[PDB]
């Protein structure tokens, strides 16, 4: 037998840690994937297995093979910051004991370790591409030995999807060019079972592995009326409801209750925030009725659920008025309107089995591993459309708790009017992946192709048109075709006419300008960079230093439907808005006659002139919300003042802090030294949402804006003075100022006691000095 990780011969420290995770023995498919010929010898690999099959273990063992037997660095590229955070702390708590230094590049976060000191960088797609562009700039591509790509099916039709192709095409081009005129950078890709996954493997010259193995079977089925029908439209059951819930006709509450009697846990995907909250309220009342009616009674581990409510109540947002009534029973909800900290606690309490029913929006289906014993889906229609089969299979694939269940179950609840949509979701299979670089009818260029051509010219890895046609032959567009020769020339002509690149006589040799080099280094989209450049110049002709709002208008993103603006509120603020802020508004182009039109009725954009005229006002409203964040105005007071949800504000922080970083590097490369001197404070300041003084203390990763303000209020104004602090004094400050059941929540950890958090804070401050002095 050679399926035990001990016989595979891993380092002792990771082996013992894997045993502590229960990973005693790998699946036959993982061994068969790792023994797939040259895969263990550096050839690229692409494999697809169900997410619950433990698919990432194969990538983790290949990272060891490329960071130990070669002392070369590896990227781990992930679709979302939460997944990147979770994977970062998992990899750290696994590999740190062999000395492999894991850190990561995700959102506005950046490591205090320089990349030369890393072995593994856990990246989001956008931060990975920015990293590779810098390694090309530095001529340090010799430092990479691997790239691991999760969710490689993201490669198609997505706003950050093509960045994954633009990354992998550059890695392929530079390596294959170096060989043509051992695989240097092993790419490991993980995907859904796309029908054209052979093509992606052949594009990457990868070995392909596919399996449909799941560690527990999956009774994927549909319910209509009382009848529950199989995917083949055999009858599975006729559902007698255990509970006569009078308020709801689809029996969903009794369909949850049916398995809760077994002490199993249910996950319940709902079309919308209000449908989740309405449904979680109903289910909790039926558990309350059932408890007094006591059809077995529920046992709820009640003392632990009280701790969950205490942790929630000690967040800056407090205990949600709907969570207050549901959570005591082990019923809750999970939706994009909650904070990240509320969601992380509620995800944790569901994982621990304290919360037994969770009504969730579709956004849970991608960003977390929550295994559930039933996955109910309340309708085949979501957001006014049929479900995407990728989303539906991301939902249903969460049925079955690995090693706990015999089989997973999923019920699509379906009306008689919807049965044809329902069966189509059950039987349907994913669309083949197709790249964004296919310019549509009526398009001469695409922003993805322009960025591709810019990155190679400004990076210098393609200089002539002979090289640009050679680069394109490495593209998944070409591999899918195997027009494009014209698409290259059209993109070159746009960059030339604006002089992001300058043409010179040899054929033609093309070189960047400073505007090209700045737009590359910023990672801004070059089509937008013409507006950003002209905006920043026009600000420098006359900048209002009188407040930070004119800076916030420049670092705030373009509007992204992050909220629905209440224009009657906005104009009623525009009266009270301070004159030092209405002076900014005049400079940036906000107009109160157009606000009156927005109050008067619907306003629309027929022209690009009218599109920006509206964007200017939405961008100003966003900058006011940021100005309240930047001044530590509580999220409840921002909500009441502007109408935003907590999760809308907290997600605006992430994009504004990312964008504040880009605009700093853009101004730095152009040499607007007076702008970068002003802008550079705002990335950290927006990320946490703090005054200028907290910005030093916040360097401690245990301190958020709340904990930094209580330490600043006590007198620990700086990290050096905090490192001096007596641990008992930090304890007493936290013990007093925050208002042992894990009082404090730390996003990288479970909840901490006051004694544990205070000691870790002081020792982390001392370590930061050691790292800063070194």
Give an overview of the whole structure.
This protein has 774 residues and is α/β, with parallel strands linked by helices. The chain contains 36 helices and 19 strands. The chain has an eight-stranded mixed sheet with strand order 10-9-8-17-14-11-13-12, with helices on both faces. Strands 3-4-2-5-6-1-7 form a seven-stranded parallel sheet, with helices on both faces. Helix 7 links the parallel strand 5 (144-149) and strand 6 (186-191). Helix 11 (302-313) runs antiparallel to helix 13, helix 18 (465-472) packs across helix 20 (484-497) and helix 29 (646-670) packs antiparallel against helix 31 (682-688). The PDB classes it as dna binding protein. The entry lists the keywords tmej, mmej, DNA binding protein. Human DNA polymerase theta helicase domain tetramer in the apo form.
* Total of DSSP H or I helical runs spanning 4+ residues: 36
In helices, the fraction of residues equals 40-55%
Which class best fits the helix and strand makeup? alpha/beta
What summary fits the major beta sheet? Answer: 8 strands, mixed
Question: What's the gyration radius in Å?
Answer: 27 Å
Task: Give the N-terminus to C-terminus distance in angstroms.
Answer: 48 Å
Overall form:
globular
Strand content: 5-15%
Main sheet: strand order: 10-9-8-17-14-11-13-12
The total count of strands amounts to 19
Domain Helicase C-terminal: 247-472
Subcellular location: Nucleus; Chromosome
Region (Helicase activity): 36-472
Motif (DEAH box): 150-153
């Amino acid at each position: 037998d050679k399926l035990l990780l001990a016989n595979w011969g891993l380092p002792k420290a990771v082996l013992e840690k894997y045993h502590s995770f229960g990973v005693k023995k790998m699946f036959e498919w993982q061994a068969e994937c790792l023994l797939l010929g040259q895969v263990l010898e550096g050839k690229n690999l692409v494999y697809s297995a169900p997410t619950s099959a433990g698919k990432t273990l194969v990538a983790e063992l290949l990272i060891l093979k490329r960071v130990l037997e070669m002392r070369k660095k590896a990227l781990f590229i992930l679709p979302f910051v939460s997944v990147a955070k979770e994977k970062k702390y998992y990899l750290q708590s696994l590999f740190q004991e062999v000395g492999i230094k894991v850190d990561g590049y995700m959102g506005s976060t950046s490591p205090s370790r320089h990349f030369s000191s890393l072995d593994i960088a856990v990246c989001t797609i956008e931060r990975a591409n920015g990293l590779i562009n810098r390694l090309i700039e530095e001529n340090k591509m010799d430092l990479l030995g691997m790239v691991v790509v999760d969710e490689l099916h993201m490669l198609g039709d997505s706003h950050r999807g093509y960045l994954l192709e633009l990354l992998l095409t550059k890695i392929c081009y530079i390596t294959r060019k170096s060989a043509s005129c051992s695989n240097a950078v092993q790419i490991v890709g993980m995907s859904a079972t796309l029908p054209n996954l052979e093509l992606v493997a052949s594009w990457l010259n990868a070995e392909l592995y596919h399996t449909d193995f799941r560690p527990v079977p999956l009774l994927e089925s549909v319910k209509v009326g009382n009848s529950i029908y199989d995917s083949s439209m055999k009858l599975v059951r006729e559902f007698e409801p255990m509970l006569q819930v009078k308020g709801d006709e689809d029996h969903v509450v009794s369909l949850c209750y049916e398995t809760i009697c077994d002490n199993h846990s249910v996950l319940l995907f709902c079309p919308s925030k209000k449908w989740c909250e309405k449904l979680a309220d109903i289910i909790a009342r039926e558990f309350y009725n059932l408890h007094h009616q006591a059809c077995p009674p529920v046992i709820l581990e009640q003392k632990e659920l009280l701790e969950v409510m205490d942790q929630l109540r000690r967040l800056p947002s407090g205990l949600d008025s709907v969570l207050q009534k549901t959570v005591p029973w082990g019923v809750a909800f999970h939706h994009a309107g909650l904070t990240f900290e509320e969601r992380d606690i509620i995800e944790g309490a569901f994982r621990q089995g304290l919360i037994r029913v969770l009504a969730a929006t579709s956004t849970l289906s991608s960003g977390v591993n929550l295994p559930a014993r039933r996955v109910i889906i309340r309708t085949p229609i979501f957001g006014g459309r049929p479900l995407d089969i990728l989303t539906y299979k991301q939902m249903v694939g969460r049925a079955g708790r690995k090693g706990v269940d015999t089989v997973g179950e999923s019920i699509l609840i379906c009306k008689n009017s919807e049965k044809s949509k329902g069966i189509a979701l059950l039987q349907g299979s994913l669309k083949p992946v197709r790249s964004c670089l296919q310019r549509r009818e009526g398009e001469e260029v695409t922003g993805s192709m322009i960025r591709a051509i810019l990155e190679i010219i400004v990076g210098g890895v393609a200089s002539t048109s002979q090289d640009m046609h050679t680069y394109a032959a490495c593209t998944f567009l070409a591999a899918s075709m195997k027009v494009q020769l014209g698409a290259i020339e059209a993109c070159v002509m746009w960059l030339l006419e604006n002089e992001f690149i300058q043409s010179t006589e040899a054929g033609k040799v093309y070189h960047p300008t400073h505007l090209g080099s700045a737009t590359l280094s910023s990672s801004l989209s070059p089509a937008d960079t013409l507006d950003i450049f002209a905006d920043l110049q026009r600000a420098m002709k006359g900048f209002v230093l009188e407040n930070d709002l004119h800076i916030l208008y420049l670092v705030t993103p373009m509007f992204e439907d992050w909220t629905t603006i209440d224009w009657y509120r906005f104009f009623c603020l525009w009266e009270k808005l301070p004159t030092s802020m209405k002076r900014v508004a005049e400079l940036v182009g906000v107009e109160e006659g157009f606000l009156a039109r927005c109050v008067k009725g619907k306003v629309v954009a027929r022209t690009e002139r009218q599109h920006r005229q509206m964007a200017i006002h939405k961008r100003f409203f966003t900058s006011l919300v940021l100005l309240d964040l930047i001044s530590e105005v509580p999220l409840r007071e921002i909500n009441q003042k502007y109408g935003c949800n907590r999760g809308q504000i907290q997600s605006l922080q992430q994009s504004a802090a990312v964008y504040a970083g880009m605009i700093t590097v853009f101004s730095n490369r152009l040499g607007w030294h007076n702008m970068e001197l002003l802008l550079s404070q705002f990335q950290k300041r927006l990320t946490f949402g703090i005054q200028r003084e907290l910005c030093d203390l916040v360097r401690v990763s245990l301190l958020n804006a709340q904990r930094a303000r209580v330490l600043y209020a006590s007198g620990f104004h700086t990290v050096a003075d905090l490192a001096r602090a007596n641990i008992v004094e930090v304890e007493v400050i936290l013990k007093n100022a925050v208002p042992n059941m894990r009082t404090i929540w730390v996003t990288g950890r479970k909840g901490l006691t006051e004694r544990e958090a205070a000691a870790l804070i002081v020792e982390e401050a001392r370590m930061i000095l050691q790292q800063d002095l070194v």
